[PDB]
What we know:
This protein is an alpha+beta fold. Helix content is 25%, strand content 30%. α3 (112-118) runs parallel beside α4 (138-150) and α7 (280-286) runs parallel beside α8.
Amino acid sequence: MDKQFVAKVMQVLNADAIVVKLNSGDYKTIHLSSIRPPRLEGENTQDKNKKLRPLYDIPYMFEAREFLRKKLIGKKVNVTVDYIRPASPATETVPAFSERTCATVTIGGINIAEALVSKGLATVIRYRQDDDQRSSHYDELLAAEARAIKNGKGLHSKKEVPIHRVADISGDTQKAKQFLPFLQRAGRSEAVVEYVFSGSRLKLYLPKETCLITFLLAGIECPRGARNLPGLVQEGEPFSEEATLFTKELVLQREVEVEVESMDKAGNFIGWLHIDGANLSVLLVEHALSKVHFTAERSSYYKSLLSAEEAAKQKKEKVWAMPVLEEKERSASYKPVFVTEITDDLHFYVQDVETGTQLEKLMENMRNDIASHPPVEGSYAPRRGEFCIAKFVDGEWYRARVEKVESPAKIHVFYIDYGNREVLPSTRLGTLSPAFSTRVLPAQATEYAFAFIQVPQDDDARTDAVDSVVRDIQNTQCLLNVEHLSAGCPHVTLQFADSKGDVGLGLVKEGLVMVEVRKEKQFQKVITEYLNAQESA
């Protein structure tokens, strides 16, 4: 990093630091040289044990953060690094050894640290040795402190300390229901974006109600992120990361206006966010970082959304756009699994036989809980990627994940413990209680493919291969051995529980499928075995 540079302020980190974006595109956290933000170090706060919120509980911290935010957010500042501390001595830091790049930050001729100090919103560090590194405008900082003292400002004031009371109904369903009608009736409410969870979900501060809420953008579907929950590991939807950054760079810590239309089961309010005359839902669609949802159809913003989506789709970009390690010995470790579903593209789902009892126990517990607390028919509008419970054709409830929301009557779900898919009406869906989520029992179904064989490209040929497998192993216990991973799901070999005959090899024997050769040494023998079968077919 250079000693001097001009950079754009992306976030105000409390009262003594900011995050800037360099011309190179990199982000840097910069602390203000020779000043300390207000801190509660030295005072007892047992009354706030594990409930202390620095922004609101530290004397003058809110005032300092707001002064900096209003003056700098989204602006270009002139920076000159004065010194670097290898490890901050502050009591609370993350991590325990945290470097601090300390600089003089100026804009329009105003030294930011000097301005904070003059208002008593920061204090000047005193140095024991004249050789200690300090701000290059140190004398000006001390002059500012004299003014703060003279005028009794901020931390130098003798007046009663200003108290800040801020309610927080973030992701709280019962509390959200209490506020919904009021927020809907208020029309456009002023708010400050405090956090951005993704391209479309944010945490907002509403000054008029001195309350914090979580908010989801209406009328669109924004790409979801990665997952690595128990039994569910996958990359995020395309451009989920860029969408988040788009929203962060545009609205983080900006004053915006929001219209609340409804709320979801998680306590998130759903509505429209307006920033400097623009509609965020429309902007995301315009930049091809989200798509229009059917909920937008009855909205006055529908035309703008369609126009944006039209231009985005024409560009055909963004949302509209394997060898393995060689090993000496081949795996060979067959374990009992229960094959539940065979897919049309010759893939299949299985459950671990060893945990079958755990799934049974969970289903009894969950279904008994559902029987006691029946989901309200039609009061649930699922969001893509959300977990839920779904009522299958057998009339029983199962854990599921929403994969696509076509309309209120057509919700595409995936039964996470079995592997089958179904299109159902929202009336046959309900919320999945935390007590029965993957936090308690992992998703039980795992997707696998046959190793060493090529899935027929010819529909009729593939259908015949699938029918054979369904007939031979669907809904039966088999032995499975993981051979290797792929760009998709893992490839395995299956053996019949009794004869222990290789299921995939059998498809080769019958001439239903061709062999897919692997180059890795561990498969030297098995590839010859498969190629021989193919020859004799």
